Design a protein around this ligand. Structure first.
Ligand SMILES: CCCCCCCCCCn1c(-c2ccc(OS(N)(=O)=O)cc2)cc2ccc(OS(N)(=O)=O)cc21
Ligand SMILES: O=C[C@H](O)[C@@H](O)[C@@H](O)CO
Ligand SMILES: O=C[C@H](O)[C@@H](O)[C@H](O)CO
Ligand SMILES: O=C[C@H](O)[C@@H](O)[C@H](O)CO
Length: 721
C-alpha cells in the first residue's frame, strides 16, 4: 500500500542504491552499474535450481557459519538493485523477480526464521542479515505484498525486539552504543517502516539519540576526541566509521518521520568530524592505529577505510546548510585531492554518493586548500596524531595503558597484532602506499617500528591485555609541539622501559631508559621497519657514508646517524643518535599471506621488501636516544644534526628531556616528584609530562599527569629561576 511509510522507503532506496540518479553517460556511475551487472550475472549462473536444494550457493552453503546467511541475502539485495534500475539488463526481468521472491521464501523456510537460534556469530543474525533483508524488501516493495513483507521481517523482530540491546535471545545480551547502536537503527527503523510500525520507529530513534552524548567513561566519544568501543579499545577508525557511515544514511529518513531528531545535535556531529575523525586522515589515509582488528582485512587498507568516513561526511554536508555545508565540502575536497594513490570512487557504492562527490570536486565554489598543521592528543584512548603542513608529513603514536587494551584479536582476525600498541609509531610521508599493498601480512610482527621487545615466540591464539601502569599520556602545548611517555612493561613481565617521545614541530625524539630484561631472551628496540617501493629505491648512509644493505643483518657500531635518501625529498628519513649507538640494519624480501593474520582472508602469497633498523639491549639499565627527522634532503639533515648536537638534556630512570633551541621549546618527562632544574633557567616539580616554550622572559606551560588524567596550576609544577 502507498503511504508515508513507502514515501520514506522511497527516500531510503534513493540512498542505498540511488537508481533515480543513474546516468549512463556518467563514466563513474556506469562503472558501478557494470560491477552490479556482473555480480547479478554471476549469482544467476551459479544459483542452485534443482528440486529441494540444500543451499542457494555452494560458496555459501554451510549455514552453520553465520557469515553465509548474510552473504546469501546480500546477493539478493544486489538483484533487487538491478531489477529496479531502468538501465540494467535485468530491469524488471521475470526470472530475477521470481528468483528474489523464491529465494526469500526458501531461506525463510529452511534457514532463517523465528524458530531458529543464533548459530555462530550473533552479528549476522541481528545486523548483517536483517539489513540485507530490509534493503531487498524496500527496493522491491512493489513486487511483494504487505503480508509477505511482514512475514519475512518477523524473524528480525524475534532476534532484535529491543532497540537498546543486542544478543537479547542469548544468555548474555549487551547494551547497544556507538556504531552498533547506529546499525540498530538501520535494522529497526527500516523494518519499522516496512512493517508500518510506529512504535518500533519512534522507540528506535529514541534509543539512537544516545549516540550524541559525550561520555567520560566506557564506550563512545570523549571531550578530547577519543572514541572507545568494545569496552576499552581505541576504535575511531572502524566502529566510528560504522557510526558516521550508517548514521549519515539514516538521517535524511529520520528527519522526515514523525519523530525527527532535535536539530541541535548535528552540531555534535560536526564536532565528531573536526575533533575525532579529521585528525586521523592524512593524504587520504585513515590511520591504522585507530582501526583495531580491521587492519588484517585485505579489502580494507587505510585509503579504502578512509572513504567510509569521507562519504559519511559529504552526506552530512548535504543535509547541512550555508557555511557549515561548504566547509565540510572543502574538508572532503582537500583530503580527496591530496590522495594521489587511491581513487576515492573505488569505494563509493551508490549513485548518490558518486553524484555528491562529483559535484563537490567540480564545484569551483568549494575551496580546496592544503590542510594546516595540527596535533591531537587523544589521551582517553592513548593515541596521538601529528601533522606538519609545511614539510608535509604525518606521525602517529600508538600506546595503551591500564585504561585501554593493546590490540584486538577476535573472530580469528588480527592474530599477530601483539605489539601494535607497544609504543609503535607511524610515519606518513610521500609514499602514500606504505601501509597498504600488503603491508600488514608481510611486516615482521616481532619488530613493529618503535617497540622494545624480547625475541620470545608468540602464539596466534593470544588475546589483548591492558598495561599494568596508568602512567601513559601526552601533554600538548600547541599545534606542533607535544610530549608523551609510556611506563612500559612487556606482555609477560620480563622487560621494562621508560619510553618517551618529544614531538618538536618537524621532528620527533625517541628516548628510552631503565631498560631491563629478566628473561633468557634477547631484548632490542626496533628503530624502524619501513616498507620499500621498487620504483623509488633508497640510498642508505651511515655517518654520512653510503652503506650497502643485505638480507643478512649488518652491525654498525659507533653510529651517529643514518639517512635514507630518495629521489623525492618528501620520502627521506633521517635518524640522529644523540650519543653514538650500536645498531644493525638489513633489507630483505618478506613473504606472507593475509590468511596468516586473518582466518577468513586469502591464503595467496604476498611479498614486500623491508628495511629494518634495530638496537640491541644486552644489559640492565640500557637506553636509546635518537631524533627522527623526515622530509629534508641530505645536506639539510647534516646541518640539522649539528644544530641538535646538544639537544638531549637528560635520559635516565627518573628524568627525560629534549630541548629545541631554535623554537625555544622543552619536552620533559618526570617519573618522580624531585626538583628538576632545566637548562639553568627553570625548575619542574612534579611527576608527569611537560611541554614548555620560552618567549622573551615568558614561559608557556603545558603539564599533564597521565595517571590522574589532570593538568595542574602552574605554581604546583613550574618555578622560574
Ligand atoms: C560493544 C562492545 C561489546 C564488546 C564486544 C562484544 C561483541 C562485539 C561484536 C563484534 N563483532 C563480531 C563477534 C562475533 C562473535 C562473538 O562471540 S562468539 N562466542 O565468539 O561467537 C563476538 C563478536 C562479529 C563482527 C563482524 C563485523 C563487525 O564490524 S566491523 N567494524 O566491520 O568489524 C563486528 C563484529
Ligand atoms: O611566563 C610567565 C609564567 O608563565 C608565569 O606566569 C607562571 O609562573 C604561571 O603563572
Ligand atoms: O578515563 C577514560 C579512559 O581513558 C578510558 O580509556 C576507559 O578506560 C575506557 O574503557
Ligand atoms: O581490559 C580488560 C578488561 O578488564 C577485561 O578483562 C574484561 O573482561 C572486560 O572486557
Amino acid at each position: 500500500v502507498k503511504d508515508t511509510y513507502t514515501d520514506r522507503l522511497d527516500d531510503w532506496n534513493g540512498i542505498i542504491a540511488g537508481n533515480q540518479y543513474y546516468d549512463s553517460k556518467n563514466d563513474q556511475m556506469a562503472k558501478l552499474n557494470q560491477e552490479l551487472e556482473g555480480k547479478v550475472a554471476d549469482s544467476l549462473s551459479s544459483i542452485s535450481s534443482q528440486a529441494d536444494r540444500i543451499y542457494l550457493w555452494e560458496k555459501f552453503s554451510n549455514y552453520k557459519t553465520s557469515a553465509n546467511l548474510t552473504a546469501t541475502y546480500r546477493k539478493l539485495e544486489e538483484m533487487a538493485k538491478q531489477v529496479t534500475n531502468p538501465s540494467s539488463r535485468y530491469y524488471q526481468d521475470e526470472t530475477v523477480v521470481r528468483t528474489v521472491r523464491d529465494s526469500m521464501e526458501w531461506m525463510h523456510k529452511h534457514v532463517y526464521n523465528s524458530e531458529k537460534s543464533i548459530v555462530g556469530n550473533w552479528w549476522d543474525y541481528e545486523i548483517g542479515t536483517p539489513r540485507a533483508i530490509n534493503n531487498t524488501l524496500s527496493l522491491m516493495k512493489e513486487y511483494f505484498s504487505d503480508e509477505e513483507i511482514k512475514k519475512y521481517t518477523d524473524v528480525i523482530e524475534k532476534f532484535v525486539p529491543d532497540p537498546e540491546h543486542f544478543r537479547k535471545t542469548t544468555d548474555n545480551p549487551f547494551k547497544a552504543l556507538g556504531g552498533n547502536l547506529v546499525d540498530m537503527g538501520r535494522v529497526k527503523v527500516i523494518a519499522g517502516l516496512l512493517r508500518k510500525d510506529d512504535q518500533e520507529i519512534s522507540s528506535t530513534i529514541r534509543s539512537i539519540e544516545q549516540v550524541f552524548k559525550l561520555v567520560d567513561q566506557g564506550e563512545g566519544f570523549y571531550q578530547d576526541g577519543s572514541y572507545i568501543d568494545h569496552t576499552n579499545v581505541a576504535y575511531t577508525g572502524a566502529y566510528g566509521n560504522v557510526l558516521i557511515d550508517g548514521l549519515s544514511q539514516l538521517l535524511p529518513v529520520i528527519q522526515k518521520t514523525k519523530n525527527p531528531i532535535d536539530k541541535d545535535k548535528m552540531q555534535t556531529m560536526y564536532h565528531w568530524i573536526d575533533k575525532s575523525f579529521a585528525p586521523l586522515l592524512v593524504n587520504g589515509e585513515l590511520m591504522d592505529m585507530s582501526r583495531g582488528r580491521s587492519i588484517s582485512r585485505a579489502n580494507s587498507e587505510g585509503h579504502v577505510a578512509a572513504v567510509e568516513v569521507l562519504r559519511g561526511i559529504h552526506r552530512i554536508a548535504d543535509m547541512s546548510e550555508g557555511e557549515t555545508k561548504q566547509r565540510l565540502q572543502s574538508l572532503v575536497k582537500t583530503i580527496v585531492q591530496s590522495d594521489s594513490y587511491y581513487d576515492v570512487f573505488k569505494n563509493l557504492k551508490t549513485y548518490k554518493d558518486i553524484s555528491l562527490m562529483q559535484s563537490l570536486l567540480s564545484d569551483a565554489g568549494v575551496a580546496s586548500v592544503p590542510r594546516t598543521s595540527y596535533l591531537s592528543a587523544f589521551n582517553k584512548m592513548d593515541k596521538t596524531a601529528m601533522y606538519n603542513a609545511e614539510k608535509g608529513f604525518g606521525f602517529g603514536l600508538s600506546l595503551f595503558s591500564s585504561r585501554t587494551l593493546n590490540y584486538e584479536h577476535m573472530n580469528k582476525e588480527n592474530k599477530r597484532g601483539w605489539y601494535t600498541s607497544d609504543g609503535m609509531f607511524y610515519l606518513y610521508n610521500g609514499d602514500l602506499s606504505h601501509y597498504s599493498d600488503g603491508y600488514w601480512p608481510t611486516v615482521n610482527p616481532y619488530k613493529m617500528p618503535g617497540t622494545t621487545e624480547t625475541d620470545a615466540k608468540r602464539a596466534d591464539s593470544d588475546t589483548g591485555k591492558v598495561l599494568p601502569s596508568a602512567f601513559v599520556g601526552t601533554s600538548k602545548l600547541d599545534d606542533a609541539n607535544a610530549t608523551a611517555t609510556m611506563d612500559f612493561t612487556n606482555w609477560n613481565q620480563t622487560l621494562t622501559a621508560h619510553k618517551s617521545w618529544f614531538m618538536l614541530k618537524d621532528k620527533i625524539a625517541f628516548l628510552g631508559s631503565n631498560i631491563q630484561n629478566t628473561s633468557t631472551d634477547t631484548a632490542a628496540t626496533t628503530i624502524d621497519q619501513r616498507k620499500l617501493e621498487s620504483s623509488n629505491p633508497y640510498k642508505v648512509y651511515v655517518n654520512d657514508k653510503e652503506a650497502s644493505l643485505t638480507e643478512q643483518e649488518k652491525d654498525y657500531p659507533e653510529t651517529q646517524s643514518v639517512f635514507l635518501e630518495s629521489s623525492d625529498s618528501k620520502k627521506n628519513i633521517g635518524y640522529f643518535f644523540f650519543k653514538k649507538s650500536s645498531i644493525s640494519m638489513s633489507k630483505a624480501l618478506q613473504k606472507g599471506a593475509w590468511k596468516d593474520i586473518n582466518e577468513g582472508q586469502s591464503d595467496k602469497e604476498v611479498e614486500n621488501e623491508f628495511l629494518t633498523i634495530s638496537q640491541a639491549h644486552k644489559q640492565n639499565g640500557d637506553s636509546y636516544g635518537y631524533m627522527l627527522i623526515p622530509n629534508v634532503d641530505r645536506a639539510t639533515f647534516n646541518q640539522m644534526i649539528k644544530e641538535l648536537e646538544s639537544s638531549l638534556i637528560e635520559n635516565n630512570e627518573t628524568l627525560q628531556s629534549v630541548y629545541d633551541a631554535k623554537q625555544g621549546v622543552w619536552g620533559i618527562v618526570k617519573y618522580d616528584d624531585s626538583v628538576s632544574t632545566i637548562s639553568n633557567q627553570f625548575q619542574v616539580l612534579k611527576r608527569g609530562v611537560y611541554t614548555i616554550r620560552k618567549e622573551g622572559d615568558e614561559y608557556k606551560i603545558a603539564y599533564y599527569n597521565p595517571e590522574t588524567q589532570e593538568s595542574a596550576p602552574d605554581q604546583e609544577v613550574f618555578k622560574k629561576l
